[PDB]
Structures are given as C-alpha cells and as structure tokens.
mmCIF file of C-alpha atoms in Angstrom:
data_model
loop_
_atom_site.group_PDB
_atom_site.id
_atom_site.type_symbol
_atom_site.label_atom_id
_atom_site.label_comp_id
_atom_site.label_asym_id
_atom_site.label_seq_id
_atom_site.Cartn_x
_atom_site.Cartn_y
_atom_site.Cartn_z
ATOM 1 C CA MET A 1 0.639 -9.031 25.024
ATOM 2 C CA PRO A 2 1.567 -6.209 22.656
ATOM 3 C CA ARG A 3 0.839 -6.509 18.940
ATOM 4 C CA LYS A 4 3.287 -4.121 17.343
ATOM 5 C CA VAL A 5 3.157 -2.893 13.743
ATOM 6 C CA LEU A 6 5.870 -0.986 11.867
ATOM 7 C CA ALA A 7 4.434 0.656 8.731
ATOM 8 C CA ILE A 8 6.019 2.525 5.831
ATOM 9 C CA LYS A 9 4.639 3.911 2.559
ATOM 10 C CA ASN A 10 6.113 4.991 -0.786
ATOM 11 C CA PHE A 11 9.202 2.771 -0.642
ATOM 12 C CA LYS A 12 9.881 4.101 -4.181
ATOM 13 C CA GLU A 13 12.950 1.906 -4.757
ATOM 14 C CA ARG A 14 14.799 3.326 -1.710
ATOM 15 C CA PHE A 15 16.956 0.283 -1.069
ATOM 16 C CA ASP A 16 19.573 2.690 0.351
ATOM 17 C CA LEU A 17 17.231 3.287 3.308
ATOM 18 C CA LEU A 18 16.704 -0.379 4.224
ATOM 19 C CA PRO A 19 19.713 -0.524 6.589
ATOM 20 C CA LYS A 20 18.019 2.154 8.714
ATOM 21 C CA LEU A 21 14.722 0.256 8.587
ATOM 22 C CA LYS A 22 16.614 -2.867 9.717
ATOM 23 C CA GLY A 23 17.950 -0.848 12.678
ATOM 24 C CA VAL A 24 14.449 0.203 13.740
ATOM 25 C CA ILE A 25 13.276 -3.413 13.459
ATOM 26 C CA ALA A 26 16.143 -4.524 15.749
ATOM 27 C CA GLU A 27 15.461 -1.759 18.290
ATOM 28 C CA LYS A 28 11.656 -1.889 18.367
ATOM 29 C CA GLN A 29 10.923 -5.559 17.540
ATOM 30 C CA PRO A 30 7.657 -5.181 15.578
ATOM 31 C CA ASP A 31 5.429 -8.238 15.218
ATOM 32 C CA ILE A 32 4.487 -7.210 11.680
ATOM 33 C CA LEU A 33 5.960 -4.978 8.999
ATOM 34 C CA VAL A 34 3.530 -3.251 6.643
ATOM 35 C CA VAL A 35 4.862 -1.868 3.358
ATOM 36 C CA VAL A 36 2.356 0.252 1.450
ATOM 37 C CA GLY A 37 3.245 1.213 -2.117
ATOM 38 C CA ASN A 38 4.470 2.757 -4.198
ATOM 39 C CA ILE A 39 7.164 0.105 -4.368
ATOM 40 C CA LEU A 40 8.275 1.209 -7.850
ATOM 41 C CA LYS A 41 8.836 4.580 -9.447
ATOM 42 C CA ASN A 42 7.746 3.266 -12.884
ATOM 43 C CA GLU A 43 7.415 6.774 -14.324
ATOM 44 C CA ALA A 44 7.450 5.877 -18.024
ATOM 45 C CA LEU A 45 4.404 3.627 -17.793
ATOM 46 C CA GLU A 46 2.380 6.216 -15.895
ATOM 47 C CA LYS A 47 3.331 9.019 -18.278
ATOM 48 C CA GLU A 48 2.369 6.980 -21.352
ATOM 49 C CA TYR A 49 -0.998 6.125 -19.806
ATOM 50 C CA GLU A 50 -1.749 9.750 -18.843
ATOM 51 C CA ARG A 51 -0.510 11.197 -22.157
ATOM 52 C CA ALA A 52 -2.522 8.660 -24.148
ATOM 53 C CA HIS A 53 -5.716 9.397 -22.263
ATOM 54 C CA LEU A 54 -5.277 13.178 -22.500
ATOM 55 C CA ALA A 55 -4.656 12.832 -26.271
ATOM 56 C CA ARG A 56 -7.549 10.346 -26.587
ATOM 57 C CA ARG A 57 -5.328 7.712 -28.222
ATOM 58 C CA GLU A 58 -4.713 4.017 -27.588
ATOM 59 C CA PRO A 59 -2.070 3.576 -24.864
ATOM 60 C CA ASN A 60 1.144 2.225 -26.374
ATOM 61 C CA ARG A 61 1.787 -1.212 -24.871
ATOM 62 C CA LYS A 62 5.337 -1.128 -26.275
ATOM 63 C CA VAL A 63 6.097 1.129 -23.276
ATOM 64 C CA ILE A 64 5.091 -1.722 -20.950
ATOM 65 C CA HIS A 65 7.085 -4.309 -22.863
ATOM 66 C CA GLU A 66 10.278 -2.209 -23.001
ATOM 67 C CA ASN A 67 10.133 -1.600 -19.237
ATOM 68 C CA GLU A 68 9.293 -5.174 -18.160
ATOM 69 C CA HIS A 69 12.903 -6.186 -17.487
ATOM 70 C CA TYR A 70 13.383 -3.195 -15.119
ATOM 71 C CA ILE A 71 10.021 -3.785 -13.389
ATOM 72 C CA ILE A 72 10.715 -7.485 -12.803
ATOM 73 C CA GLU A 73 14.316 -7.015 -11.631
ATOM 74 C CA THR A 74 13.331 -4.208 -9.264
ATOM 75 C CA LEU A 75 10.348 -6.083 -7.801
ATOM 76 C CA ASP A 76 12.456 -9.206 -7.312
ATOM 77 C CA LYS A 77 15.049 -7.083 -5.497
ATOM 78 C CA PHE A 78 12.324 -5.557 -3.334
ATOM 79 C CA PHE A 79 10.950 -8.934 -2.255
ATOM 80 C CA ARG A 80 14.437 -10.251 -1.515
ATOM 81 C CA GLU A 81 15.569 -7.228 0.509
ATOM 82 C CA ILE A 82 12.303 -6.874 2.402
ATOM 83 C CA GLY A 83 12.170 -10.667 2.919
ATOM 84 C CA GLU A 84 15.677 -10.664 4.422
ATOM 85 C CA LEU A 85 14.474 -8.305 7.180
ATOM 86 C CA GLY A 86 12.859 -11.487 8.534
ATOM 87 C CA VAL A 87 9.607 -10.026 9.926
ATOM 88 C CA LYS A 88 6.054 -11.176 9.134
ATOM 89 C CA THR A 89 5.272 -8.676 6.381
ATOM 90 C CA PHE A 90 2.200 -7.468 4.517
ATOM 91 C CA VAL A 91 2.712 -5.631 1.229
ATOM 92 C CA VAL A 92 0.006 -3.606 -0.566
ATOM 93 C CA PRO A 93 0.777 -2.279 -4.072
ATOM 94 C CA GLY A 94 0.622 1.373 -5.075
ATOM 95 C CA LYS A 95 -0.525 3.174 -8.222
ATOM 96 C CA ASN A 96 2.866 2.562 -9.869
ATOM 97 C CA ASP A 97 3.138 -1.125 -9.006
ATOM 98 C CA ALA A 98 1.934 -2.241 -12.385
ATOM 99 C CA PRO A 99 1.241 -4.252 -14.440
ATOM 100 C CA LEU A 100 -0.657 -6.033 -11.668
ATOM 101 C CA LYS A 101 -0.049 -9.387 -13.387
ATOM 102 C CA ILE A 102 3.726 -8.793 -13.201
ATOM 103 C CA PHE A 103 3.546 -7.575 -9.602
ATOM 104 C CA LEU A 104 1.615 -10.691 -8.548
ATOM 105 C CA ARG A 105 4.001 -12.962 -10.442
ATOM 106 C CA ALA A 106 6.860 -11.414 -8.442
ATOM 107 C CA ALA A 107 4.858 -11.974 -5.236
ATOM 108 C CA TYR A 108 4.274 -15.607 -6.212
ATOM 109 C CA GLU A 109 7.987 -16.163 -6.944
ATOM 110 C CA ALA A 110 8.933 -14.761 -3.545
ATOM 111 C CA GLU A 111 6.873 -17.358 -1.644
ATOM 112 C CA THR A 112 9.420 -20.170 -1.151
ATOM 113 C CA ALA A 113 12.407 -18.061 -0.113
ATOM 114 C CA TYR A 114 10.385 -15.454 1.787
ATOM 115 C CA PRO A 115 7.363 -17.146 3.413
ATOM 116 C CA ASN A 116 7.281 -14.187 5.844
ATOM 117 C CA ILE A 117 5.835 -11.998 3.067
ATOM 118 C CA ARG A 118 2.168 -11.846 2.113
ATOM 119 C CA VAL A 119 0.902 -9.494 -0.582
ATOM 120 C CA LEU A 120 -2.625 -8.271 0.173
ATOM 121 C CA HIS A 121 -4.531 -6.862 -2.749
ATOM 122 C CA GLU A 122 -8.287 -7.398 -3.074
ATOM 123 C CA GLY A 123 -7.771 -10.008 -0.373
ATOM 124 C CA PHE A 124 -7.241 -10.794 3.247
ATOM 125 C CA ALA A 125 -5.261 -12.767 5.772
ATOM 126 C CA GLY A 126 -5.847 -13.776 9.372
ATOM 127 C CA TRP A 127 -3.193 -12.743 11.899
ATOM 128 C CA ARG A 128 -2.529 -14.443 15.270
ATOM 129 C CA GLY A 129 -6.145 -15.700 15.286
ATOM 130 C CA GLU A 130 -7.351 -12.276 16.467
ATOM 131 C CA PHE A 131 -7.203 -9.989 13.418
ATOM 132 C CA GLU A 132 -8.313 -10.026 9.822
ATOM 133 C CA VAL A 133 -5.988 -7.942 7.662
ATOM 134 C CA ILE A 134 -7.514 -6.642 4.428
ATOM 135 C CA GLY A 135 -5.511 -5.023 1.630
ATOM 136 C CA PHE A 136 -6.653 -3.106 -1.431
ATOM 137 C CA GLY A 137 -3.928 -1.278 -3.340
ATOM 138 C CA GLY A 138 -3.780 1.160 -6.222
ATOM 139 C CA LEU A 139 -5.275 4.621 -6.611
ATOM 140 C CA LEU A 140 -8.957 4.461 -5.680
ATOM 141 C CA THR A 141 -11.016 6.827 -7.796
ATOM 142 C CA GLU A 142 -14.594 7.534 -8.761
ATOM 143 C CA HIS A 143 -14.476 6.293 -12.350
ATOM 144 C CA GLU A 144 -10.967 5.134 -13.431
ATOM 145 C CA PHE A 145 -10.067 1.451 -13.899
ATOM 146 C CA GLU A 146 -6.577 0.394 -15.032
ATOM 147 C CA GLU A 147 -4.188 -2.409 -14.065
ATOM 148 C CA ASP A 148 -1.469 -2.455 -16.735
ATOM 149 C CA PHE A 149 0.210 0.974 -16.969
ATOM 150 C CA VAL A 150 -0.848 1.934 -13.440
ATOM 151 C CA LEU A 151 -3.173 0.552 -10.754
ATOM 152 C CA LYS A 152 -6.393 2.583 -10.582
ATOM 153 C CA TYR A 153 -9.791 1.327 -9.399
ATOM 154 C CA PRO A 154 -13.297 2.843 -9.550
ATOM 155 C CA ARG A 155 -15.713 3.109 -6.610
ATOM 156 C CA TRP A 156 -18.177 0.549 -7.990
ATOM 157 C CA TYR A 157 -15.475 -2.117 -8.305
ATOM 158 C CA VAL A 158 -13.939 -1.457 -4.889
ATOM 159 C CA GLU A 159 -17.385 -1.784 -3.285
ATOM 160 C CA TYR A 160 -18.175 -4.875 -5.370
ATOM 161 C CA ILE A 161 -14.983 -6.712 -4.414
ATOM 162 C CA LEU A 162 -15.088 -5.766 -0.726
ATOM 163 C CA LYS A 163 -18.409 -7.554 -0.248
ATOM 164 C CA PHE A 164 -16.179 -10.470 0.857
ATOM 165 C CA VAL A 165 -15.452 -8.819 4.212
ATOM 166 C CA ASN A 166 -18.952 -9.748 5.499
ATOM 167 C CA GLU A 167 -18.230 -13.416 4.709
ATOM 168 C CA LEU A 168 -15.101 -13.539 6.894
ATOM 169 C CA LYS A 169 -14.491 -14.838 10.415
ATOM 170 C CA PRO A 170 -15.591 -12.114 12.888
ATOM 171 C CA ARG A 171 -12.338 -10.538 14.124
ATOM 172 C CA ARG A 172 -10.668 -7.176 14.725
ATOM 173 C CA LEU A 173 -10.302 -5.604 11.294
ATOM 174 C CA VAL A 174 -7.162 -3.896 9.994
ATOM 175 C CA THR A 175 -7.421 -2.416 6.488
ATOM 176 C CA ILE A 176 -4.443 -1.344 4.398
ATOM 177 C CA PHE A 177 -4.951 0.918 1.379
ATOM 178 C CA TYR A 178 -2.591 2.779 -0.897
ATOM 179 C CA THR A 179 -5.215 5.536 -1.108
ATOM 180 C CA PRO A 180 -6.028 7.491 2.064
ATOM 181 C CA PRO A 181 -9.436 8.893 2.991
ATOM 182 C CA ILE A 182 -10.176 12.615 3.072
ATOM 183 C CA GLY A 183 -8.892 13.831 6.444
ATOM 184 C CA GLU A 184 -7.281 16.763 8.219
ATOM 185 C CA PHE A 185 -3.818 15.182 8.068
ATOM 186 C CA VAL A 186 -3.956 11.721 6.545
ATOM 187 C CA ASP A 187 -4.335 12.897 2.931
ATOM 188 C CA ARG A 188 -2.567 16.252 3.156
ATOM 189 C CA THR A 189 0.810 17.957 3.455
ATOM 190 C CA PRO A 190 1.507 21.535 4.630
ATOM 191 C CA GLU A 191 2.355 22.519 0.999
ATOM 192 C CA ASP A 192 -1.272 22.808 -0.101
ATOM 193 C CA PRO A 193 -4.641 22.758 1.713
ATOM 194 C CA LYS A 194 -5.894 20.407 -1.015
ATOM 195 C CA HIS A 195 -6.954 16.890 -0.156
ATOM 196 C CA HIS A 196 -5.127 14.169 -2.050
ATOM 197 C CA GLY A 197 -7.081 11.144 -0.872
ATOM 198 C CA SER A 198 -10.434 9.780 -2.000
ATOM 199 C CA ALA A 199 -13.996 9.897 -0.725
ATOM 200 C CA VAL A 200 -14.096 6.279 -1.877
ATOM 201 C CA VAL A 201 -11.942 5.407 1.122
ATOM 202 C CA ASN A 202 -14.134 7.371 3.568
ATOM 203 C CA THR A 203 -16.973 5.338 2.111
ATOM 204 C CA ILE A 204 -15.122 2.000 2.497
ATOM 205 C CA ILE A 205 -14.299 2.932 6.080
ATOM 206 C CA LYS A 206 -17.971 3.750 6.755
ATOM 207 C CA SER A 207 -19.066 0.483 5.132
ATOM 208 C CA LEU A 208 -16.503 -1.852 6.743
ATOM 209 C CA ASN A 209 -15.986 -0.009 10.055
ATOM 210 C CA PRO A 210 -12.428 -1.284 10.544
ATOM 211 C CA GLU A 211 -10.574 -0.757 13.824
ATOM 212 C CA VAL A 212 -7.482 0.607 12.072
ATOM 213 C CA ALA A 213 -6.672 1.719 8.545
ATOM 214 C CA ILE A 214 -3.064 2.072 7.366
ATOM 215 C CA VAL A 215 -2.817 4.270 4.266
ATOM 216 C CA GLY A 216 -0.295 5.644 1.743
ATOM 217 C CA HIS A 217 -0.099 7.929 -1.312
ATOM 218 C CA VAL A 218 0.081 11.559 -0.086
ATOM 219 C CA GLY A 219 -0.317 12.371 3.609
ATOM 220 C CA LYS A 220 1.058 11.995 7.129
ATOM 221 C CA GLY A 221 -0.670 11.697 10.467
ATOM 222 C CA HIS A 222 -3.228 9.820 12.468
ATOM 223 C CA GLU A 223 -6.857 10.680 13.100
ATOM 224 C CA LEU A 224 -10.347 9.251 13.454
ATOM 225 C CA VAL A 225 -12.375 8.790 10.283
ATOM 226 C CA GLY A 226 -15.788 7.662 11.472
ATOM 227 C CA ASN A 227 -14.846 5.190 14.223
ATOM 228 C CA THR A 228 -11.618 4.069 12.516
ATOM 229 C CA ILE A 229 -8.095 5.112 13.524
ATOM 230 C CA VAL A 230 -6.438 6.033 10.233
ATOM 231 C CA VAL A 231 -2.636 6.108 10.126
ATOM 232 C CA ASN A 232 -0.572 7.513 7.273
ATOM 233 C CA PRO A 233 3.099 6.873 8.138
ATOM 234 C CA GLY A 234 4.415 9.746 5.990
ATOM 235 C CA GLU A 235 7.109 9.460 3.344
ATOM 236 C CA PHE A 236 9.722 6.723 3.566
ATOM 237 C CA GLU A 237 11.976 9.085 1.488
ATOM 238 C CA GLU A 238 11.853 11.500 4.420
ATOM 239 C CA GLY A 239 12.981 8.681 6.735
ATOM 240 C CA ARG A 240 9.476 8.432 8.169
ATOM 241 C CA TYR A 241 7.581 5.427 9.494
ATOM 242 C CA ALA A 242 4.719 4.661 11.883
ATOM 243 C CA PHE A 243 4.799 2.362 14.888
ATOM 244 C CA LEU A 244 1.502 0.997 16.205
ATOM 245 C CA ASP A 245 0.665 -1.016 19.293
ATOM 246 C CA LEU A 246 -2.732 -2.577 18.559
ATOM 247 C CA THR A 247 -3.104 -3.925 22.092
ATOM 248 C CA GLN A 248 -2.957 -0.557 23.838
ATOM 249 C CA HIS A 249 -3.790 1.611 20.797
ATOM 250 C CA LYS A 250 -0.489 3.490 20.993
ATOM 251 C CA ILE A 251 0.297 5.274 17.704
ATOM 252 C CA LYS A 252 3.648 6.953 17.033
ATOM 253 C CA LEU A 253 4.785 8.719 13.879
ATOM 254 C CA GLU A 254 8.562 8.557 13.903
ATOM 255 C CA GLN A 255 11.590 9.348 11.778
ATOM 256 C CA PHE A 256 15.007 7.677 11.550
ATOM 257 C CA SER A 257 17.397 9.337 13.984
#
C-alpha cells in the first residue's frame, strides 16, 4: 500500500517545465503532488518592501496595485495548469506569493474547476484517513511580519497559530513549509557554507515532532532534524523534484532526464 508523494519547490512561473512534470507524474504515479512556493517571481513588490524598510519610509502600495493584474493572471494560470495535471495536490505559498489576500482569492476561485487542489497555509487537511498534512508558507523569521508585499512571519506568530496541531485527530503528521530548518543540506547549496533556513523551523519541528517535513526556499537534500525526516526537493528551475514513499520511507531526490 504505497503512499507516494512528488514534491517540487520554487515553481517561479516555470510553466515551460510543466510538460516534463506531467511526464514524471505519468511514469511514477504519485498519490499526491506537493508544490511549495515560490509560485510567483513578483520581484517589484519585494524590492519596494525592502527598499522602503531600508530607507525607513512607508511602503508604496501603488506598487501592489499596479502589479495586481499580473499577479492575478499568473496565479490563475498556475492553478489551471497545476489543476490539469489531475493529481491530489497541496500547495503552500512562498515569500513572493503575496498579497496573501490575492493568493487566497485565487485559491478560492480554483475550487470548482480544480477540486484536486488544496492550498495549505496556517491550516491542515486529513489525507486517506491516516495523515494530517499541515502547511505554513512564507519566510519564517525571528521578528518580521508582512503579508502584502511579501509573506514573512515572526516566530511568536508561527508558534501561536500552530497551537492548533494539538487539537487535531491523532495521525501521522506531514508538515510543509516554504522555509527550511537549519541543516547540513536542507537549507544550503555548495555555493556558500551559510545557512539560509530558519531556527524557527527547527523549533517548530521540535515542538510538533512531525514524521516528515517538506521544505522550500534555498536548499536541497534530505536529513533528520530531531526525529523528523526533512526533504528539500531542490530547485524546480534545475529540473529537480523529490519522490517520497511514506509507506516504506523511501526518499529519492531526482532530476528530469
């Protein structure tokens, strides 16, 4: 009774790569598809936010308004093209999948045509009566909190929201985060020894003790953090994905061939 998961991260508007993803789905027949953000590039919003904060000035919401048409059209295209792959799918937004209100409106709109898709952000879903799948997107940080120009959350809020996990049906826990924990591989690349994840996620993992964590942002690999198997699929732009068998705990980091 395998329970197979195909995961990608940093889709970053790479619709050109979806035919290859479709091929993998046909060949490997995953039970679920997990798409971790970033879904969008959305560079202008992020730059305005960062520039404004560095200059200690009020972020210019005109930048949001002038980019709304692009954000909406691109998100709608994402839900359609992912939906058409036809797999049960969980989507968790990245730092650039903002404004959150617009992202969630797109998710809502996708529900009738693509009932196979569920967005998980500060929320959960049961799967096959055996798992609880928890998602919490955005960049998790010590002290930053933003949802309009970018998605960033502070430790206190992440911990506050995730108190819900202890209220859930007792099941095998799978957590999906945009932000990876500090690890040897899962928050690093060979280009710098610096860690690009967050201690907040090590802390969440310690607190929740999930069986598996699927993570995004920067990193590639699989390793134990506490008792949790943490999997960072690597960059979708590099043709990379992860394939997990939750029944036998088989983890493979693969690349389109």
